[PDB]
């Protein structure tokens, strides 16, 4: 049985700049397991009806997972533009899969500031779809940075610093993006 549970019920999620990816293969997929994971702030599929998923056979399912703030959930969608979509998690324009987000103020917001969830702030070139960039190289606007991030020296990751009293726009949201891949290889993720 496909371990969708392990994705959705994990203790902590990844920062979006270093998102996780669980390949999901050679398993029976019961997507009803998904439904029983608390009300979802977002459940917008792409190229597929969610209500038909047990009728479909895929050769891979990819499960990507990360945390972003509320207003940015808009950016987890094909063709999107901005800090998150262009530097952390780009989706391809022919995307077939689902994006599932939900408020996790309760598990990720802390009163002294949760600085462990980080986003990439800038990047000379955008990510190819599904690309991941774990870099932390300081950037020098000044024509000599060394280990000093100062005035014209810039660190490229920042911290959401979640706090329970932030408006729902800046609260932590757990995203699972599910990518259904269709090759000529015998389909190994099916219903029951």
């Amino acid at each position, epitope marked *: 049985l496909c371990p969708f549970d392990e994705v959705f019920n994990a203790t902590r999620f990844a920062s979006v700049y270093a998102w996780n990816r669980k390949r999901i293969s050679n398993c029976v997929a019961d997507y009803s397991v998904l439904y029983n994971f608390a009300p979802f702030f977002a459940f917008k599929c792409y190229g597929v009806s969610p209500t038909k998923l047990n009728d479909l056979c895929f050769t891979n399912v990819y499960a990507d997972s990360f945390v972003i703030r509320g207003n940015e959930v808009s950016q987890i969608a094909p063709g999107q533009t901005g800090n998150i979509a262009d530097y952390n998690y780009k989706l391809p324009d022919d995307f077939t899969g689902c994006v599932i987000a939900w408020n996790s103020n309760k598990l990720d917001s802390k009163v002294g500031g949760n600085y462990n969830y980080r986003y990439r702030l800038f990047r*000379k070139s955008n990510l190819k779809p599904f690309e991941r960039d774990i870099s932390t190289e300081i950037y020098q606007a000044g024509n000599p940075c060394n280990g000093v991030a100062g005035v014209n020296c810039y660190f490229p990751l920042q911290s959401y610093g979640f706090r329970p009293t932030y408006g729902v726009g800046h609260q932590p949201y757990r995203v699972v993006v599910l990518s259904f891949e269709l090759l000529h290889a015998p389909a190994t993720v099916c219903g029951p």
Partner: single-chain antibody
Amino acid sequence: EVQLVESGGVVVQPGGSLRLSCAASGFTFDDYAMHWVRQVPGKGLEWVSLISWDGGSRDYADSVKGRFTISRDNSKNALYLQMHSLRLEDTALYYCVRPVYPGYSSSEFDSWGQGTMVTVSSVLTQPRSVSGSPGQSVTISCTGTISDVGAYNYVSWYQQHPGKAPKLIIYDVIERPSGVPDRFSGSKSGNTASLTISGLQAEDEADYHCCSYAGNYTWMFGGGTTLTVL
């Protein structure tokens, strides 16, 4: 140490054509997206065009599409804006701008040339003028849509004193570049972002402009004057 010198401004007849030029130095040009912004008579700051660090991506304001062509030549550290089919509406002071950060969607512009006047002859909403007294606290509105201000967390405010280019004083809704004193704060609710100034000095008798990312690869500004009553 960053220097942007514009050039090309001249009086042109409508229908005419003209090529503006930017020369860059003081940063690695090769990394940044480069923008053009114009200062229209009466109507404030107007974003024009931007071109990716390698010239492969170019976007344009609707008022300009398919009459203006942005381009660059990194070997010369240069950035050009070729103009065709010029119109009265295009009369403006044309600025050459580089954003604070690299990347195509950088939404904060801390570097501005002096601007090159371009004359042709044969919109987010801001209070026009606002007034406070030294020490009191004024605020300034910036109303857009859910596709510009209300859509993203990339709202910026720029200050401008006479004969100077815009100076970036607030970026990413609530951030302050080094040296901006903290009596300048910024906020955003719905499609309205606000610049608030406390502890009001008379050196804040100036003009104040906001800018938001507007989706696709596109930006928009406004226009507003403060008089510190003396």
